[PDB]
DNA sequence: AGTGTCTTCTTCTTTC
DNA sequence: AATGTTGTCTTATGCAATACTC
DNA sequence: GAGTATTGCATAAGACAACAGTGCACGAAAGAAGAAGACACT
DNA sequence: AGTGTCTTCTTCTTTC
DNA sequence: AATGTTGTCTTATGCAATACTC
DNA sequence: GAGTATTGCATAAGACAACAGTGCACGAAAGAAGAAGACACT
């Protein structure tokens, strides 16, 4: 019966099927009666998101710093990535100060073209005064991420692991278990850069040295259904790119291209 | 491209102690790369060559000079390990090698002008030289030299923009494979394709479509 | 903005609700006249009208 | 607005405050008493009740 | 082009697809040829180990200690389980010492009977000769787990979490969000005791107390094949108990009983 | 079932160390006993003993209430009403109260004095072996026979048995019909071993292809 | 004995060990030239070469 | 244990190899006269008898 | 009465 | 003011290649 | 003479793991090692 | 004599 | 000597049972 | 009247965290606020 169950729960909170048992109560009634004690239940939460990217190259550069223990005299490595055609460039330094960053942003521009956004974290070196005037002199935009958050710069964070693994396996090739001699601490990063740039990565089709010079840009996409807040999938959108876990959909009549998770997309017809 | 790479050494005092500089230029869509090394050493020569390779590509039939620290058997072995044709041509020698000296004066005047622009009549301080040298790279390799309509980087890389995928073989409901279609966005399961001439769009299962020849 | 269509005991299809804050497991009940703090499961509910 | 159980640096969930403005995967949260707006990734909030 | 590829990997350690595309060699040949440097040859095996357990209702016990901050000054809790029909017994002491677990087990025995074997941690209070002689005089076999692994006692390291959650709910379901007054914990622990094992826990359709008192044991089982380390599934075995994993297999030829993961089991015929 | 009526009692002899004024409770149906220490005769220190007894035995229905001391407070009355158990509150001694607990009290006194004498300490016992001594008496009196019967209280209250055959099962899958009913066995993944009720033959019917009959 | 590599609590893979006898989830491990024969859980051994 | 055959660099099936307790993925095998133990992947080895 | 073991009183070790 | 990610391994499945067979 | 009949391939899913300025610290119970002082045989 | 900004120093704070 | 686990959630199907549709 | 849409419930089939004695500590670069010796006024 629908009696004594309320006080049984509010005194000895237990499972729904157990409460239904010994009281001949249906599963639905048990559920609706247990979903009243705010101390119990109310589990689900949390959502997700993606990092905006750039369709064309030279738009969304990212940069960061690291520390290599076996780089004895000056570890303090700096790395930059393109986030459109995945190419990387590294630089060596001995002390993290806001002259090293300015020096580092002088070989990257020489090697690649000229970017338009250098979004990074909010470390003390970047958010200085001498750096803002230097940046404004060239004329590049600048933005930062949420303080404390680490997943914003996911691309460079992931590339760091690959860089470290490659450098380690190359170091222990001729035999060097400790800090590399300073004489040979030179023409060793060049080999790593060459290997990581002018060759295929994983199982992809083209090197990110031609994927940068001659990229591919589409002009229209097949009809596609996209999930909305409600269960309904809206149609009338056009996809632009579709990777492992992201999509770059665009409206048919307003041109408001936005990036969404790759789960909320299905083909049409 | 990447045929007749030319590199050479030149002294310069208006600098760090650093009494030497190594320059390298390709004799096709001439692009310039210079290091900032000190005393002459075969190890430094190897370092310069490695940096040039990493920044441009893998060349062949490289000629620099004869004599000096270039006949080292260690250097010979290092070169042979990658495997590159080597030429012992005379440094300068006029002929079709003189563009090294042609560009040396251009680099010298450019660097002195840009140095004297921001003060420092006599000598630049030590912690002001990396970016100073780096800016010259960009200023010389991203603009027309003095008469062309195409930059050296353009003439070297042949930039272009694409909008269509490769040809792809399509299976139809007869067992055989149809010809004359292009691939598009690789969706989940489906492998949407477009016609070459009639401009159609159609989603097709992955197992019903294969790469073309 | 757009209201919802929900059950409590018999049927309360009436307006006065929102989808401005939408979740997969809940819908954040909030009345345009008095507001609410309880939230509702999203599976057992549906769009209004 | 509907409050959350916003997570703290080490780890916990407490009835902190509610949310003012939303958008993509980031949101602005208020404070009950001192009233300092804080940006926070969406994957850290949790609805109440 | 193979000779070049032999030295290309030694020089660079690029990858099989890249080697195939740059030397026009088949993928099988490339994969075969790339095995010379263990640096690039990770070769992970990592083995697998799982599920030690007993069978008889009153033959294996486990016990351990926990610290509860919300609890009164006597903030040390001893908890024990019987890993045949899961039953929970918990007491509170406040000072981890040798004389603590000689009254703890004395209290525990008086509601469950005499067990036959105990396996616990190799800590301090379980090693004194004072406790060793007490165990010998009472007449119970004793053993210990490996020095350092915390997974050897998973059957109780999972139960204590549920106990903590239940006690926290019961505490802050009545306006006590702090140190409980010293006049309520004795009455609250009894209600926790009653609520833990007198009703179904989760989805199994039997109360733990009745499972302990009137268990079920069967003789002989259906045919079944087990994939022993010799690649393929042998014969001559019968399954006599099988739950959410941790299968147990009895010999069919002469005699033996063993515990194996539930992966090496197929219901023959 | 052997759960019909319980009895409670408060006992002197503080020869047993401080935390004296013992509390005892015995079932009539199966003759099982539980005793606990106390600080003083207080209403609040009654529910503690009652909850301990409930957790160790079960939920009673009728309890012979001792009359006079503290079992009249509104707090205790509402506590009892919360769980909904029937208290008697009759005349103690003659037919209620001290009607069955005499022998239990005598036996527990004999046991405690014998265990005390067996290990020394003629005088008041040191206040460090209280529970460890009480547990031995508990175990002896509830597991090692009370009189001269083969009806020890644990066995006569829980009825221990051993089972070999599981619940019945129906195989209504062939054309919508089942047999008289068979026996389920080990419920491994994918299938469900089933044995015949009479011929006793094992079949690996699919798990989706069996149902719980009646 | 086949050379295997082990896993100490500071997430670092040590070499120079050989196995002696295995069991049903535990193994006996001995050092190369500094034998301190001990037991080890199964999920801490990686084959080498 | 029983004789086994493995694939050496000049691929063929040969004898003189005993397999101990096996292991998924990589295995170990011993000699008869030299008594030399090696690790070999799974698909490269086949039972002899 | 040197020492010599018994008594006692320190100073390290392991595991959680 | 401002959002995870890819290189390596693993296991699942349809079609040719030598019996096959009645 | 067509089923069939397995087996060796050529490929699609499908997880897995680490990347983040750097690592240690203390409290407590029981036991063991060793060493200094003290009363008896020497 | 009282002040009192200028300059220099002396702390404290915030991110990684 | 001496070996991971289980109460909570969601998402993935079938088929009886209404609701219809020319 | 047979082919069809909707539901609802009923499974069932996977995934999913958290548990371990207690938690912090330190270095470095850049900026910011406040305060003291000091030569105006005074
Ligand atoms: Zn509740
Ligand atoms: Zn390699």
Give a concise summary.
The PDB classes it as viral protein/dna. The structure is a homooctamer. With 269 residues, chain A is an alpha+beta fold.
Report helical residue fraction of chain A: 25-40%
Largest sheet of chain A: 4 strands, antiparallel
Measured on Cα atoms, how large is the radius of gyration of chain A?
27 Å
Strand neighbour order, sheet with most strands of chain A: 7-5-4-9
- Could you say which small molecules are bound to this protein? zinc ion
- The percentage of residues in β strands of chain A lies in 5-15%
CATH class of the largest domain in chain A: Alpha Beta
What structural class is derived from the secondary structure elements of chain A?
Answer: alpha+beta
Biggest interface between protein chains, with counts per chain? A-B, 37 and 36 residues
Shape of chain A: extended
What are the secondary-structure elements of chain A, in order, as H or E?
A: HHHEEEHHHHHHEEEEEE
* Oligomerization: homooctamer
Subunit structure (chain B): Homodimer; further associates as a homooctamer.
Protein name (chain B): Integrase
Cofactor (chain B): Mg(2+); Mn(2+)
Question: Can you give a write-up of this model?
Answer:
The structure is a homooctamer. Chain A is α+β, with helices and mostly antiparallel strands. Chain A folds into 2 domains: 152 residues, Ribonuclease H-like superfamily/Ribonuclease H (Nucleotidyltransferase, domain 5, 2-Layer Sandwich); 45 residues, SH3 type barrels (Roll), CATH 2.30.30. Helix content of chain A is 26%, strand content 12%. Chain A contains 9 helices and 9 strands. A 4-stranded antiparallel β-sheet of chain A has the order 7-5-4-9, with no helix packed on it. In chain A, strands 1-2-3 form a 3-stranded antiparallel β-sheet. A two-stranded antiparallel ribbon of chain A has the order 6-8. In chain A, strand 4 and strand 5 form a beta hairpin. Chain A is extended and about 85 Å long. Chains A and B meet through helix 5, helix 8 and strand 9 of A and helix 1 and helix 4 of B. The structure holds zinc ion (2 copies). The site of one zinc ion (ZN) has 5 residues of chain E, from loops. One zinc ion binds next to loops of chain A. Chain A binds 6 DNA strands through helix 7.
